[PDB]
Every structure is written in C-alpha cells, then in structure tokens.
Amino acid sequence: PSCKHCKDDVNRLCRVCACHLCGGRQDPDKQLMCDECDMAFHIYCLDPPLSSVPSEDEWYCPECRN
Amino acid sequence: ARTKQ
Ligand SMILES: [Cl-]
Ligand SMILES: [Cl-]
Ligand SMILES: [Zn+2]
Ligand SMILES: [Zn+2]
Ligand SMILES: [Zn+2]
Ligand SMILES: [Zn+2]
C-alpha cells in the first residue's frame, strides 16, 4: 500500500494522499501540490478558491505559507 | 504551480 491511511481505496476519501481539504481524488489537473509539505489541494477547495491554476512557479498551501 | 496532473 502506497498510502497507509486509506490503503489506496479509490472509494475512500483521503486527505493524506488526495485533496488535503476534501479528500477527493478527482481533477488531479486542478490539484495544486504544496512546494513545502507536498500535500494536494483542489483549486476549488481553497479559500478563496481559484478559477484556474496559478502560472507562478512556487505555490505554498494555506498551512505552509506566510 | 505544480499540479498532481
Ligand atoms: Cl486517515
Ligand atoms: Cl498537515
Ligand atoms: Zn490515502
Ligand atoms: Zn478538494
Ligand atoms: Zn503545505
Ligand atoms: Zn493539514
């Protein structure tokens, strides 16, 4: 098992190996990877939510930024 | 930004 938290069950929400906010695995093209902790975040789960993926190279999540 | 992709 890659992920011990969800044992890679696709019908299981997992905030560890999928979107850290909602636990969803859908839209990996819209999941930002934090350049610090490497957690994933749907742009639409962020607050505020982003309409598109930022073009800027570095992105840090609500938890790792400031 | 990097995405899971
Ligand atoms: Cl868990
Ligand atoms: Cl965390
Ligand atoms: Zn998992
Ligand atoms: Zn999400
Ligand atoms: Zn982070
Ligand atoms: Zn967290």
Numbering used by the authors:
A (entry chain B): 300 to 365
B (entry chain D): 1 to 5
Article sentences:
Human UHRF1 (huUHRF1; ubiquitin-like containing PHD and RING finger domains 1), also called ICBP90, is a multi-domain nuclear protein associated with cellular proliferation and epigenetic regulation. huUHRF1 contains a plant homeodomain or PHD finger (huUHRF1-PHD) that was shown to be necessary in the opening of dense chromocenter structures, possibly through its chromatin-binding ability. We proved that huUHRF1-PHD is a histone H3 reader that shows preference for unmethylated versus trimethylated H3K4. In this work we show that the PHD finger of human UHRF1 represents a new mode of histone H3 recognition that requires the appendage of an additional zinc finger, relies mainly on the recognition of H3R2, and shows preference for unmethylated H3K4, although it can accommodate H3K4me3 without compromising the complex formation.
To determine the molecular basis of histone recognition, we solved the crystal structure of hUHRF1-PHD296–367 in complex with the unmodified histone H3 peptide at 1.95 Å resolution. As predicted from the protein sequence, the structure consists of a canonical PHD finger (residues 318–363) preceded by an additional zinc finger (residues 296–317). The additional zinc finger involves the residues C302, C305, C313 and C316, which are strictly conserved across the UHRF1 family, and delimits the H3K4 binding site, as detailed below. The histone peptide binds in a shallow groove on the protein surface, and only five out its eight residues were clearly observed in the electron density maps. The peptide does not adopt an extended β-strand conformation as was observed in the structures of AIRE1 or BHC80, but instead it folds in a bent conformation with a sharp turn of nearly 90° at the position of H3K4, which projects its carbonyl group outwards. huUHRF1-PHD296–367 accommodates the side chains of H3K4 and H3R2 simultaneously in two adjacent binding surfaces that are separated by the side chain of a conserved methionine (M332). The side chain of H3K4 sits in a broad flat open surface, with the ε-amino group making hydrogen bonds with the side chain of Q330, with the carbonyl oxygen of C316 and with a water molecule that simultaneously binds to the side chain of Q330. The N-terminal amino group of H3A1 is hydrogen bonded to the carbonyl oxygen atoms of P353 and E355. On the other hand, the backbone carbonyl oxygen of H3R2 is hydrogen bonded to the amino group of M332, while its side chain sits in a pocket adjacent to the H3K4 binding site, with the guanidinium group interacting with the carboxylates of the invariant residues D334 and D337.
